[PDB]
């Protein structure tokens, strides 16, 4: 996260860290949506151009964390993966369209003050909140600059940007399964996700029921916090039919 600040303890209890076993390192962020399911970006697991194709045994899920590198004894919970599900139409060949994947944990994690699931949006909430100008929040342990890494979870609040502006900022073909966010270069404020933040949540707080909903997944961007550029996020509601299908078909 570039130009964000340290998160408060318990601020994003659904934040998950995707951790590689060998070598031990941070791969991506993710989110807890139930006691047994984790949501992340498909590119975190599969990206053939860079020969990346991680399976269940290559990873560990770390929940309830605040510090990036420290083993938070008695606080975080580490889980093994039972099964990974990548969207069948994930487009890694062209523009990362449908960049989403679900991960089924081996056994349910117990919730606590630091571990709690985020809500997936319904049509009405998505309709009312996903509007240009409205702000959402992104969190993660990714780079602080395009160019080190933070000691603790970072947070930044960014406004959703108008589709035409998103479209006109890149040569890449943008689809209905993506949305972009960030400040325009003339707005004064700045901030953005960066390497390592991918797969993490873009959340919004509903002013109707006071709950946090995950509207997007950190997907891609050109550099980090570059002027006239914006962060791209997977549109979670548009892909909700697939999420629901996988969950009731697999557990």
């Amino acid at each position: 996260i570039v130009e964000g600040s340290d998160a408060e303890i318990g601020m994003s209890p659904w934040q998950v860290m995707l951790f590689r076993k060998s070598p031990q390192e941070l791969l991506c962020g993710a989110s807890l949506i139930s006691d047994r399911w984790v949501l992340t970006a498909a590119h975190c697991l599969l990206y053939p151009p860079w020969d990346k194709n991680f399976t269940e045994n290559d990873l560990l899920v770390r929940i309830g964390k605040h510090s990036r590198t420290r083993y938070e004894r008695n606080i975080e919970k580490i889980s093994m993966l039972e099964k990974i599900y990548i969207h069948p139409r994930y487009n890694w060949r062209e523009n990362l369209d449908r960049d989403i994947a679900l991960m089924k944990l081996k056994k349910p994690v117990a919730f606590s003050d630091y571990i709690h699931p985020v809500c997936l949006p319904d049509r009405e909430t998505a309709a009312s909140l996903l509007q240009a100008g409205y702000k959402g929040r992104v969190t993660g342990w990714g780079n602080l600059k395009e160019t080190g890494q933070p000691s603790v979870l970072q947070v930044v609040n960014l406004p959703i940007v108008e589709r035409p502006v998103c479209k006109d900022s890149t040569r890449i073909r943008i689809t209905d399964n993506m949305f972009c966010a960030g400040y325009k270069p003339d707005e004064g404020k700045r901030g953005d996700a960066c390497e390592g933040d991918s797969g993490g949540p873009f959340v919004m707080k509903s002013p109707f029921n006071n709950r946090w909903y995950q509207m997007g997944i950190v997907s891609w961007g050109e550099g980090c916090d570059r002027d006239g550029k914006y962060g791209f996020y997977t549109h979670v509601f548009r892909l909700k039919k697939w999420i629901q299908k996988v969950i009731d078909q697999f557990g």
């Binding site: 031990q24 560990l60 590198t69 420290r70 093994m80």
Partner: peptide
């Protein structure tokens, strides 16, 4: 710079 995690999870 990641701290050693319990061998039981590997």
């Amino acid at each position: 710079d990641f701290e050693e995690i319990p061998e039981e999870y590997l």
